[PDB]
Amino acid sequence: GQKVHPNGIRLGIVKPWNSTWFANTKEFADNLDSDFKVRQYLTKELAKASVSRIVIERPAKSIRVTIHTARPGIVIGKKGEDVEKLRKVVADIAGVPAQINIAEVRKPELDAKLVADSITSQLERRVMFRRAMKRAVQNAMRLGAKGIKVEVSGRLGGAEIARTEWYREGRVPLHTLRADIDYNTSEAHTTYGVIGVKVWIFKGEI
Template sequence: KGEDIEKLKTEVSAMMGIPVHINIEEIRKPELDATLVAQGVAQQLERRIMFRRAMKRSVTNAMRLGAEGIKINVSGRLNGAEIARAEWYREGRVPLHTLRADVDYGTAEANTTYGIIGVKVWLFKGEILDTEALMREKMLSHKSPDSK
């Protein structure tokens, strides 16, 4: 692994003409990464696995490993249909309008004999809470009863 990183670093620095620093981060749970889930569904579609089964399998895997919600959208000539359509499957909750929600988004394309099928994945991991604001609120709430 280390020599591959060095080889990549030398190739990129030769391409750019400047020294390059590469930081590689391991994905501990690939089932909780939206891009990897989308690529997995796309690969299954390319191997002619039924799209509903592929979506359902990915959703259950993500929910089992701790996602609070997941939505998968598959669109194109599904099952070789003459008219393209879009189908989606959702489990849990995926709040797309909530700013503090940690929603991971990923896309992939499956090249089938009938054409390209697009896969979109929204994965809700939980809410990002501002710890400083929470501590300030706690301090204020503890002080208010004493002043009465």
């Protein structure tokens, strides 16, 4: 039937949070909305920058945004111009002084978000779904992932009846809480509808 979100079920055990700050009931909603606006802006500008995830931390009267990307060069820009411009807008949205830092996600094949984004981009460019899924699985296994599961659902190939396909290699234990299961989703807006892509990556336990 329905499956629990691997990140949510492992939030306190073997996973970190994407937002780490303490706030009372008065400013809890305001901080959440500001973080949502900051993430929406950064994702839109850095969509071509291969940003795996964004971590927003709020020190005393400050906001430190760490952007994990597989292409640090484009995000940083020449002489830090791009990150400085991003820092200005993030500070404007948050209302408190901002500090944007860039982290490098080495081995981009072993990242659920990057694989899902790549598959959706290929599907939008009318690349065969089976070819994209097999290549993604083969790359992850070659790089050293202990297991990967890729699921693509929707009107595959323009068929009037939607279907769900999935390829799994290695071990992908979703019932082991001490498993470092990296899970992420993405959607591709094709000419026939919306196609959803889910990626599970198992990189070992503990």
